Structure formats: C-alpha cells, structure tokens
Design a binder for these strands. Sequence first.
RNA 1: GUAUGUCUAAAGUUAUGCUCUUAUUUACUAACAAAAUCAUUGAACUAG
Lengths: 182, 48, 562, 48, 172, 223, 48
Amino acid sequence: HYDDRVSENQGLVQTYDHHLSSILALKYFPDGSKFISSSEDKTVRIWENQINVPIKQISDTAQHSMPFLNVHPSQNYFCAQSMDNRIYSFSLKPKYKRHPKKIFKGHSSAGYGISLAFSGDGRYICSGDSKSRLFTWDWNTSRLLNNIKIPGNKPITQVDWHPQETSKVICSGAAGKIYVCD
Amino acid sequence: DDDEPPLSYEQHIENIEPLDPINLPLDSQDDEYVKDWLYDSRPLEEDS
Amino acid sequence: VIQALGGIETILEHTLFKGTGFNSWEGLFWEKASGFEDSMQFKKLTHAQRTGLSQIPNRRFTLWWSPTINRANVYVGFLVQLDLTGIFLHGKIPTLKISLIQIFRAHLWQKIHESIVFDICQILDGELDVLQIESVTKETVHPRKSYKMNSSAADITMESVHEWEVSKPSLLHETNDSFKGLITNKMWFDVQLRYGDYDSHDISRYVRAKFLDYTTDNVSMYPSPTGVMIGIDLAYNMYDAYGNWFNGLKPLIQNSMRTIMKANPALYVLRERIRKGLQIYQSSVQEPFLNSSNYAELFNNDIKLFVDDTNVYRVTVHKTFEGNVATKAINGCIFTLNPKTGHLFLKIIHTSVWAGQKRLSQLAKWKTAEEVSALVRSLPKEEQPKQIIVTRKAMLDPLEVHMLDFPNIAIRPTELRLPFSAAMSIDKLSDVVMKATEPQMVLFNIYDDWLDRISSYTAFSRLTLLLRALKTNEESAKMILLSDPTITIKSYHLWPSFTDEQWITIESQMRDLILTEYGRKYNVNISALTQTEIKDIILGQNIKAPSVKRQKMAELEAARSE
Amino acid sequence: IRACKDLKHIIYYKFNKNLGKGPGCGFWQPAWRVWLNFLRGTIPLLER
Amino acid sequence: NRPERIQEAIAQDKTISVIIDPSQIGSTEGKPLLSMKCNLYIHEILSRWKASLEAYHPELFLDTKKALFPLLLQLRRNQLAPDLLISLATVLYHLQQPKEINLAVQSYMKLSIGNVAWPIGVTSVGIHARSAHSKIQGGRNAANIMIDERTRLWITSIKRLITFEEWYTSNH
Amino acid sequence: HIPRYIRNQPWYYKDYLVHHRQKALDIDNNSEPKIGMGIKDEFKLSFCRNCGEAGHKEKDCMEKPRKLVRADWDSRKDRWYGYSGKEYNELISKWERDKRNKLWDTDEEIELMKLELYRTSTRLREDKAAYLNDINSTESNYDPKSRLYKTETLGAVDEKSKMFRRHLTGEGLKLNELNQFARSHAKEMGIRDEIEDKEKVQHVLVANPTKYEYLKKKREQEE
Amino acid sequence: LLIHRKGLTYLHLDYNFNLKPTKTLTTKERKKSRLGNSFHLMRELLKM
RNA sequence: GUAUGUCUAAAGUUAUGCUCUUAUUUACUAACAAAAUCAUUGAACUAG
Ligand SMILES: O=P(O)(O)O[C@H]1[C@H](OP(=O)(O)O)[C@@H](OP(=O)(O)O)[C@H](OP(=O)(O)O)[C@@H](OP(=O)(O)O)[C@H]1OP(=O)(O)O
Ligand SMILES: [Zn+2]
C-alpha cells in the first residue's frame, strides 16, 4: 500500500502479507474502506485500509483459485471468476457469505485470467471465454442468455460493460484487436 | 583446558631439560652389583 | 523416625533449606492443597498432557533434596555442567536438571555475578580517597566468564595513587594480617559463584583453592599476582573471601559482603525462585500494595510509571486448511503511563517481534519487561521513575529480573484492577497500533490538556471513569462520548474538547453506566453500599484484600469516636 | 572400574601403614594392567 | 600554532546558522554541514542553560557537558554514522519548532531505542529451549542505547537537553 | 500449626519445641548469610631388622633394605591442605624480579574550550545502589524484594502493623484533603451511611471527580 | 572428520574429547546427530 | 506444545416454493484468556 504524498520509503505506508502465494486480483469496496484480494493460494481475503489484518477469509475444499474480482453495481455483492469455469458471488456485508444460488456457468476460463463485468444497471453480468466468445447471464436467475462469437479465434480475456450505455460492451484478448458488442 | 589445543612437542617440550625421575638413592656397597644399571630403560640390554 | 534420622537439624542439612533463606523451619508449611497441576487436572487435556502433569510434584521433591541427590561423593559419574550456570551435575538426572533450569532461567547466574561485581565497583568508587585508590575499572570479561569454572579473570582492577602495603593472602575474617613486606600498586577483585552440595559446601576452602589455583596457573589472566577472590555459595547462602589485604580494605570487604549478601536484589530473586520451586511461602511484604486506601500516593511528587502488558500479545482467529482454527498474532502495545503528568509511552509491539517464536504468552511477559528496561535506560537518572506499578502478577518476576540493572527503582504491585486494558478502545490508539509497520514508541498525553484546568488526581479519576466505562460497555460508552457532533476531537488529542461543565455530565453518564451494569451483573444494590464500597467499585479494589479490613476498622473507630 | 577400586584399597592400606591419609601413592602398575587387559578385549569389538 | 588555529575555528564556526531543514536531514552530500549545524545548536542550548544555571539543576550541567563532549567532537569531525545523525537531527529539528516538544521526545525515543525488534533481548526465559531463541538474544542487533556506555551517556544527555528546552520555553 | 508428631516430646527428654531446637546450619535464623567457617589444616603426631626402629616389620620398612600426619569431604579433597605460602612466595618472587628487570588534537581542545572543560551491560555504574550506603551499619533500610529504600523523608513505619507508609507530598495532600471534603459533604447532605439512599452515588469522590474539585475550588474562596 | 562428513558441524569436539552442541538443535538435527556407542566409546578411550 | 510436512515466486537469459437483510439456536475448533468470597501464596509450570 502506497500513498504518493509520502516521500518516506517512497510512500510505502503498509504491507499485507497473510497470502501464501502470488496475488491474483485486487478490488476495493465502492466506499474505499475495505478491499478484497485473491491469490494463487486458493483463498480470498478482505482487508481494512492500511491494517495488516484480514477481517474475512473465504476458502473451501472445492473452491478453486479466483483469478478475477469485480463488484456488482448495487454494492451488495461481489463476484469472482474461478478456475472451475464458474463465477461465484459473495455478500459485501459482514461475514460476507457465499451466495448459494447466484452462480453463473457456461463459459470456459480455466488457464486464463478472464475478466468479468456488470451492466450499468446491474441487471446483467457478462464475461469473456477461452474460445473467443462473450457470455452474458441474467443477474437475478443466473441463466445464460447469450454467447456472442468474437472474431480472431483467440481467447477473449478482456471484457467491460459501458457505465451509461444500455448494451455496449467491449472485449479483447490474444487476437490484439478490440471489439465492441451491442 | 578443553579449549587449549595440544602442545607442539618440538616447539614446547623437546627443548626443555627433563626433571629428575623417581630414583631411590642406592648404596655404594650394599647395591654395588645393581647400582650402575637398575634405573636404565632396558637394563643390561648391551651386556652380551 | 525424626529422632532416628538425627532430628530436624540433621534432616534439613540434606535439603536445599539453607538456600531458601527461609527464616525458621517452623514456618515450613508446604502448600499440600494447591499448585499448577491441581488447576490443570480438570481441563480438556490429551492423554500425553495428563501423564505429563506428574512431573511437576516430582520436580519439587527432587529440588528439595537436590543437595543430596547431586552430592559430590558418588561411586562413578562424569561431571556435566548445566548450561548457563556454574552448576555441575555428577550424573544425568533430568528432573533435577529441569528444576535447576527453572530456577536459573533468564540468565540469572550471569545477572547475579554482574550485580555483585557492580556493587563492589560502586562501593570502591566511594572509597578512592580513604583507601588511596587512583581508579577502579570494571573489566570487559568474556560473556561466559561468570560460569567459566576452570579458569578466571579479574572482574575489577584498581590502581593506587601511590602504592599499597599488602599482606600475604588471607581469609576475609582472619585477624591481624601483617601489612609489612609485600608492596603493590595494582589490586584486583574476582567474584566467583558456586553452587554447593551436601558434600562440598566449605566456601572458605573453595575461595582459597580458587585464589591459589588461578594465581599460580600458567595462564595469563590477572594483571598482578595480588588481589581478592570473593566467593558466594548460592545453594547454601554462604560467602567468604581470600587474598591480599591492605590497611582498611579488609574491614570494608567484611561490611560490604555482609550488606551485599543481605540486600542485593539478584540474590533475593534467586531465593524467591527457589522458594517458588518448592512451593514454600512467607508473608514478607514491607510496604502495602497500591490500594483504594492509599492511591493518593500516585500523585506524590516522585516519578512513577504504571505498566500494563494486557495488550502486548494479541491474536486473531482464522480457519486453517486442515479445518481447525489457528491464532495469528497482530500488532499489540505496552501501556506505560505516568499518572502525574499524563505522559503515555505507548510502545507498539509489531508482529515481527514474534517471528518464529512459540509459547508467546510467556515470551510476551519478558518482552514487556525488556521494553520497560529499554525505556528506563533511555531516560537520564534524574528522570527515571522511582517506582514502577505492576498491574498484573504475571509481570512481577520478568520485570524484577530486568530491573536488576536498576536497583533503585521500587517495584510495586497493586490491589486495583485498573481499566488500562480498555486503552485499545480509544479509536486514536487502536488506529496507531493497528497501522504500525515496525516497532515504534509513540507518545501521547492521555489527559490531553485537562491539566491546564484540573489537578492531576482529577484527570486520573476522569480517565479511570472513561476507561472503566469503555471496558464495561464499549458501544454505549462511545455513544456517550460522541453524543454531541459539535465537540470535535482535535488532532494531537484523544478525547473530545469538552469544557469542565460538560465533563461533569459526561462523568455522570459514565459513572451511572459503570455502577448500574455492576449492580445488575452482580445483583448488588448500589444504594445500600457505603462510600468506600462505591470507591472500590470504580477503582476495582480487590474486596478480598486485607486493606479493606483495615480500612473498615479505620472508619469504625471513628464510628466509636463520635 | 571395580577392580581398580579394589586394587587401590589393598595398595593404599599397604602403602599408608605409618603415613595416614593424603595424596602420594604412585604405585599405578596394577590399575595400569587392568586397563591394558580391558583394551585387549575392546580391540576386536571396536574394530568391528 | 594551536591558539591561532583554535581562534580561527571558533571564528569560522559563526559563518553558518543553526536552523535545521527537514530536507537536509539525510542528505549524503550535506551530511558534514548538518553535523556541524547540530553541534552548534547543542552549544546554543548549553549556552542558555549556562545563562540559567542557578535556576535549573546546576549540579547536572557539568556532567551533561562532559557526557556530550564525545558527541560534539564526533559531530565536528563528521564521524557520526548516518543513521545516528539522521535521528539526532530529527530531534534537534523538532526542538527548534515553536511547540513540538512531544515530537522531539518521540524522535528521541526513535534515536535511543529505534525500530529494532528486540532492543535489549532476552536469554533462555523458559525451560523449553528452541533454536529460535538465539535470534531474540539481542547482542549486536541491540538498540543505540546499548552500543556502549559513551553512547548512552550522550544520548541521555540529549534527552536532558530536551527537558531543559521544555522548561525554558515554558517559563520564558 | 505444627503437627502433633512434631510438638510431642519423646519420654527420654522429660520452648515448646525445645527437643528440636539443638540447631553450619541454623534452623532458627536461616535467613542470615553465613561467613565461611575458616580453614584448619591440622596435623597430629619388636625391633625392625632393617632400621632398628620398633613398630613395623621388614616388609613395611620405609628405609632402603641394607646389609607428622594429617588430622568433611572438602577437607579431605582440598589439594591445598597443609599449604604454607610456598607456591605464592615463588610466584611473588618471580613477579618482583620481573618488576625490577623493567594531549588534545585541536578538535578536542576547541570543544573542551567551548565547554569550559580541562555488547555492553544495562546497569549504570554511576547509579549507586542505595543499600551500598549502609555497609557501615547493622540495620537494613532497603527491602530486597520491592527494592524500596526506606527513609524518614519518604515515609514512616506504622509499628502497629509493621508496614511502611509513604508520606503524602504535593498533589497527594490535595487529594487527601479533597477526599476529606467529599466525606464531610456526605454527612452534610444527609445521605450518610446507614441509610439506603439512591442519591449516595452522587457524593463519591472518584465517581464525581470534576464536580468535587470545582466544588472545593468554589468553597475555598468562602472559608 | 567423521563428524563433519556426516554434516554435524553443529557438534563441536573439544580438545579433551568432549562432544557438545554449539546451538540448540532441531529434532531432525538431534535425530541425525545421534551418534552410537562405537563413536562414544572410541571418544572416551581417546579421552582416557 | 510437538513430531512432521509443505512453501520461498528474475535472470546465473542456450541461437528458430427459491434467495436476501438481520436477531438468535446448535455443533465443531482455538498453548487465545491471571475471571471479586467460600499485609495479599495455581503461576511460566502439562504432550503422542
Ligand atoms: O571414602 P573413604 O572411606 O574416606 O576412602 C578414601 C577414598 O577412597 P575410596 O572411597 O575409594 O575408598 C579416597 O578416594 P576418592 O574419594 O577420592 O575417590 C581416597 O583418596 P584418593 O583420591 O587418593 O584415591 C582416600 O585415600 P587416602 O587414604 O589417601 O585419604 C580414601 O581414604 P581411606 O581409604 O584411607 O579411608
Ligand atoms: Zn624398618
């Protein structure tokens, strides 16, 4: 943790060290009081700003490592792309338990750091796919509504949904070119 | 001492003149036959 | 059977009794009904942990008879020196070994040696003109010298202004030494510690033997062939000296060794540890603990510090991969407060302190004592505290050992249960402690600026109410403190900038929260209690303590008066 | 070890008849023999 | 010529000011100037204690000067190690500010004890020996207050100076 | 209390424990540190065919064949038993023979002028332990346990309970007097003690510190 | 040389043939450095 | 508290109904914790 205003030690104001393997993803809470972290150690941890103590630890026998993290527009839940080709969801309120029903399945992502995004209104969730496609699911029922094929025949690791447009999404990956879907 | 390394014979012992051994003073007449050789390392070794 | 064994005298000669310093054999009341193993037998323990509890009483028994169990007159037995001590075990006896290790733990043997050496140095430092000493030098001996039992070195060397007419080597109490003849300009002192046994405990022959052996030995060690060999037998509380004497030195060493043996605190620590190892106790308290009856002494002009270890070792619990829950250490702090000025020396105990260590509950007490010692050494003599108030019994022994380097600092226990543990409820202190990235000392005035308007005892009482309230119910106490959003807590402050008129209302709300929750929890009618009982509730006075009895009489005598 | 203790007993009481207690008996030949015979049997054991 | 060089040095000493700057603290190139500036500010404090000797602990002044002598000598010679100079300079800097006495005392605690995990260390505190205990024994890894008795003497004299500056600034 | 089997005295004997008081070890004053017992290297004092002297046979003779004695484990093991200075005299003669056989640098001067002048152990050498001042006396002021150094200036012994009480100084007196003030105020306001009044909590000093301090500060101007 | 070939550098053999650890050993180091009677008997003979 | 196991991540470059908010119940785990009746004493101590 750095604070560019501080010149001491180049601004390194805090170090979090409870993870045991390479960090995979980082994501702040919308209010910036806490942040989420994922690691190759197969655990997810929640931290208070500048305090080297994880307030929550998310780990399970069947839980795979989560290469990507994002927060739902409502600020009530966060989602994690998992190596088991699934997307899980977790509450953003104390104890942060895993949501037993909001699980999105269908795409392929094992072996790739594939990002996931939410529609501007939070009505939908979407993600890339290792076989050059863009999946999209309904946020309420988690039902897969579409899987658009993206040119280039390469993994589409980058996906983002426009914060104001009703349906414009951008994606890219190993093909190099950036594509817009609508 | 446990920390003291064994002394070098040629540097610390070989040059010091040895002290007297335990030799009971023999009588010139009562020990005439033994006096000249009793305390040798191998008494009479050279006497054929 | 007592008569057949030769009476109490003969029986006790086989025991460690003389080393305990206990006054009389009559007071030898063994606490046959309490001990650690008695507290442990009910707990959730594994079969291994239960079988291991029997070692404790066996250790006590072995320690009591240790002078006989480790006697020198044995049929066979290679001498094995016990680590960090000058004790030799004539055989491998694990139960004895471990009990002796428990007594000499925290490097006590080396501390005793240095303490006595410093005492002799400090005495000689005042006799420069009387004894015609040009200078006194405390030698930079090898770190293990105090338990190097086959050779030695001078601990102290003194240079004369002119020269001294020294007698032949003689015992400390030998009368009429001839000072004529031998003359020397440099004299040395060597303090030898030993641990006698039932066969070998004649300290006089020991000191003579050490003096003659080390002076005649071919080793280059002493700066001159003239000096004094001082010997102390730790197992038998015996002392003697042998060496050259000059006019006036012998009487001085006789008087000083008698005083050092009686008053030196390191030897006292050794005696108390032996008694603890035996579970024998004597009521030897000369000054009363800090109590609700004498707490006004806190505000005396003498410098004093409260020390609280409660937050030194702190842990968070998390689920392990195996399915258990593991404790992980987090940042802690040592609460050191001067109640007169309000200066709080908050030592942040960063997690890196515990890296790779186990048995942290124990190590944290030693860490607290070590940081207190570092703080004291960081203060100039005129600023060092005259007394340190130990809020928890667990800290007494570690601090007593670490304070052997500061023999003028009185250690004072307390009968109070002061709420300093609730200091981590103060948002600013919690923040500073939890965000620290390295070991650090942070200073705060726990009274902020109240001292410009109220007395120190008033500030301490206000602080006590705020802390005891936070300890009683943190959320409702915080609700009281933050009841008005206009009263901003300034920077460089811990509490809101209330005026004293507002402080009276805050104190009333805190007081009521504390007393109503106490009355509810214990079903005590606060209205029936006496003024002193209410005081004892806010201060947390131990109701079982004798001071409550004596204070009751100190007021019922007035109830007789008029 | 017992043999040497026994030898010391018989040796000292012969040696000290009109001398009393204290160091000075240097008749090491019998105990020395005891240890040489110990080595005779210890040799094959330690070699193996 | 000893008196000539001495008077020239006592004169040259006045060509620089004692005011410390937070950016100068820790400058490798400016280290000699900061070291001299620190020595000079210490002398300034001592001159004010000399000016108030009969009102504030006269018996301690002599011992304080005798203890500060090795520090001042090393500062003149720029021999004081970088870490020690940075700490000392931080103390004197806070001491020069209008009302930062507590910050000066915190910086002094950083100078004396510092950030070492075990300022003094502990040896065999229990009956269960472990290899890890060798680390916490301290020794060479101890705090600055443990380097040697001369260092403790001058460091605590600096503390005594902070206490004097507090007394002086409050009465005057 | 002492058990019956200790208190009871064997018939052959006849203090209540006199049979066990015979008491080197002193079971009655075991707290006193003991000086060494001193060194006493004491010594005591048919015709033989070989030497003529009577009392031994030929084989036991100390004369070559022809034609004082020593008086505790430590005593027996002392390798210096019977020593009379020989080894130390030799050492001293050797040392006596070898004895007979054989500025400031401007920086220091400028600093001394400006000052008007002319690992390691934790203990401070100049910080003399208080008990070291009492070596020339029999009484002990220093408590080795608490490290308290008793003085008439610091406090006084109560004698009734043998405890030592620190005198009150400065703000300590102020608090003790404020304590008295609140206590009187309790009797004054009528809350008193025997009466189970709810208002009592309002008149406890520690429970109402700022109130009573300001209240005394007020009344002090009226006295 | 035997001690060092086994990697037991944490065991120091004194010049009087005492064998002591130079630090507190881990349980694995203790198990690995558990020398047998042949070594210890040889060492005691060298000590004598 | 152990045995014991695992980790240590640049470079020293090999050529191309079903949920949620939240107040509880129950179980398991915690060498975390000096807990106020029954002249001040469980107290640093227990492991296959
Ligand atoms: O214990 P004691 O009955 O008094 O006998 C001792 C003892 O010999 P033992 O115990 O083996 O019989 C000594 O041996 P250590 O205790 O030292 O092992 C020995 O002295 P040494 O060391 O020279 O062997 C000494 O002999 P001395 O007559 O010279 O005193 C001898 O005494 P006694 O056998 O004459 O009683
Ligand atoms: Zn004869």
